[PDB]
Amino acid sequence: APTIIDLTCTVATCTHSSDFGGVLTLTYKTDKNGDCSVHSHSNVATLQE
Amino acid sequence: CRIHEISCGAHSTQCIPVSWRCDGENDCDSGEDEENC
Ligand SMILES: [Ca+2]
């Protein structure tokens, strides 16, 4: 499995609506390409993918 | 690369997992995997 190090997060736009009104971008450094599982550990916001 | 990885041609050193072959997205440098599929 890939290893992700030095990951910091930021949000571009947000609008609390019934749709998925918000985008966030993640920056990281890895060693090899692959597919990772992504999840939000809180309840306030729900992801899409 | 790994047994489960295919390089995007000999001219490039980048290797991608085989699950990305013909997924409808140009995962290679210039969509080599999506070619001839
Ligand atoms: Ca592909």
Curated annotation (Swiss-Prot), chain B:
Q: What is the effect of changing residue 27 to A?
A: Complete loss of interaction with Semliki virus spike glycoprotein E1
Tissue specificity field: Abundant in heart and skeletal muscle; also ovary and kidney; not in liver.
Per the UniProt entry, the effect of residue 5 to A is: Complete loss of interaction with Semliki virus spike glycoprotein E1
Q: Where in the cell is it found?
A: Cell membrane; Membrane, Clathrin-coated pit
Its PTM note reads: Glycosylated.
The segment annotated (Microbial infection) Interaction with Semliki virus spike glycoprotein E1 runs over 5-27
Give disulfide pairs as residue numbers. 1-15, 8-28, 22-37
Give residue ranges for domain LDL-receptor class A: 1-37
- From which domain of life does this come? Eukaryota
Function, as annotated: Multifunctional cell surface receptor that binds VLDL and transports it into cells by endocytosis and therefore plays an important role in energy metabolism. Also binds to a wide range of other molecules including Reelin/RELN or apolipoprotein E/APOE-containing ligands as well as clusterin/CLU. In the off-state of the pathway, forms homooligomers or heterooligomers with LRP8. Upon binding to ligands, homooligomers are rearranged to higher order receptor clusters that transmit the extracellular RELN signal to intracellular signaling processes by binding to DAB1. (Microbial infection) Acts as a receptor for Semliki Forest virus.
Disorder: Cerebellar ataxia, impaired intellectual development, and dysequilibrium syndrome 1: An autosomal recessive, congenital, non-progressive cerebellar ataxia associated with disturbed equilibrium, delayed ambulation, intellectual disability, cerebellar hypoplasia and mild cerebral gyral simplification. Additional features include short stature, strabismus, pes planus and, rarely, seizures.
Subunit architecture: Homooligomer. Binds to the extracellular matrix protein Reelin/RELN. Interacts with LRP8. Interacts with LDLRAP1. Interacts with SNX17. Interacts with DAB1. Interacts with PCSK9. Interacts with PAFAH1B3 and PAFAH1B2, the catalytic complex of (PAF-AH (I)) heterotetrameric enzyme; these interactions may modulate the Reelin pathway. Interacts with STX5; this interaction mediates VLDLR translocation from the endoplasmic reticulum to the plasma membrane. Interacts with CLU. (Microbial infection) Interacts with protein VP1 of the minor-group human rhinoviruses (HRVs) through the second and third LDL-receptor class A domains.
What is the protein name given in its UniProt record? Answer: Very low-density lipoprotein receptor
**What is the scientific name of the source organism?**
Homo sapiens
Q: What gene does the UniProt entry assign to this protein?
A: VLDLR
